[PDB]
Design a protein around this ligand. Structure first.
Ligand SMILES: [Mg+2]
Length: 362
């Protein structure tokens, strides 16, 4: 099991049996800002179980995130892929993404099941409304207080010093560097540094210029998230070497994000430019290789189960309806992306052990 391979995990799916209605599977088709364009594309809410807001279809159907055997199945697959950590998409209590319901109440279950399969759970802080340094203090405190003592709570284990909680902060650039420094620098007015709520905060880098803002803010690392090679400066493989050089200089953890493909045209029909065909694993393996070549401290996978953007490595099956041929992993099996990850996890795990200075060869 690889403690340095993280995967982004979503717990926002619901169905009639466990949630009293469908959630997320019935995603609306998103409206292009220009109405002259939007009118040429589909409109309205997908209708599960046969019509869902994904280009692929899961082996578990249009499942519920709070169905305990779904959570267990997911824990199995991750373990079997040799992924040690799930980075759980997180919104504060009684808050949600605009197309979903609250999910913080499910965290205790997920931690218990992760523990059962000896996996760890870190937190992917979403851009909730009015997120700032002040309510980020409160939420870091909350997370560490409520879940910090749980045996599946993730901490990055340094060789010396106390192991630190990790927080991936999606859309960190929305908040100005001077606000972040209140929280993340040593002498900031609401500094968590050297406090019981310290951790490793990882910022999303989109554009190259965001590098400097990230330094000024006091973040401990960067990650790139997007599965589409070429969508952002950060998500382009060719820039990964430089980002790594930058992070090395400034003592930041570089965490590249690798995906198996991308397709979101079931909810963003206009966004065909960011589609990337999986070509039977080749796209994903080009990604993993590019990540490996930078000799990173951690690698992140986008994603376990973001079905809307088609970046999932979770088991998918062929499916056809009277108007839809879903994409699938044929001619390979539903577990293809799990098997490819297991391969590359083991390779990373072996190569990574030779990075450290104490391990360096004569
Ligand atoms: Mg160091």
């Amino acid at each position: 099991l690889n403690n340095y391979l993280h995967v982004f995990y979503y717990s926002w799916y619901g169905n009639p049996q466990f949630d009293g209605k469908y959630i997320h599977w019935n995603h609306p088709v998103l409206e292009h800002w220009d109405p002259r364009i939007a009118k040429n594309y589909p409109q309205g809410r997908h209708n599960p179980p046969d019509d869902i807001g994904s280009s692929f279809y899961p082996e578990l159907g249009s499942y519920s995130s709070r169905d305990p055997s779904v959570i267990e199945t997911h824990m199995r697959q991750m373990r079997s892929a040799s992924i040690g950590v799930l980075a759980l998409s997180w919104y504060p209590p009684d808050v949600n993404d605009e197309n979903g319901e609250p999910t913080d109440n499910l965290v205790p279950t997920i931690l218990d099941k992760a523990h059962k399969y000896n996996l760890k759970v870190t937190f992917h802080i979403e851009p909730y409304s009015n997120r700032d340094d002040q309510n980020m203090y409160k939420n870091v405190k909350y997370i560490i207080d409520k879940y910090g003592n749980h045996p599946a709570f993730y901490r990055y284990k340094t060789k010396t010093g106390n192991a630190l909680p990790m927080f991936y902060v999606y859309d960190s650039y929305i908040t100005k560097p001077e606000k972040w420094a209140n929280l993340l620098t040593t002498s900031g007015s609401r500094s968590i540094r050297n406090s019981p709520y310290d951790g490793l905060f990882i910022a999303l880098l989109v554009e190259e210029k965001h590098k400097y803002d990230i330094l000024q803010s006091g973040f401990d690392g960067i990650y790139t998230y997007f599965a589409t090679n070429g969508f952002t400066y950060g998500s382009s493989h060719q820039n990964w070497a430089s980002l790594k050089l930058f992070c090395d200089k400034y003592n930041l953890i570089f965490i590249p994000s690798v995906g198996p493909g991308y397709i979101d045209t079931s909810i963003r029909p206009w966004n065909t430019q960011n589609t990337r065909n999986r070509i039977n694993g080749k796209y994903y393996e080009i990604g993993l290789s590019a990540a490996l070549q930078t000799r990173p401290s951690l690698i992140s996978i986008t994603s376990f189960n973001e079905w809307h953007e088609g970046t999932q490595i979770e088991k998918a099956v062929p499916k056809r309806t009277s108007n839809t041929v879903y994409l699938d992993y044929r001619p390979h099996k539903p577990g293809l992306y799990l098997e490819l990850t297991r391969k590359w996890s083991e390779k990373y795990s072996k190569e990574r052990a030779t990075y450290a200075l104490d391990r360096q060869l004569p």
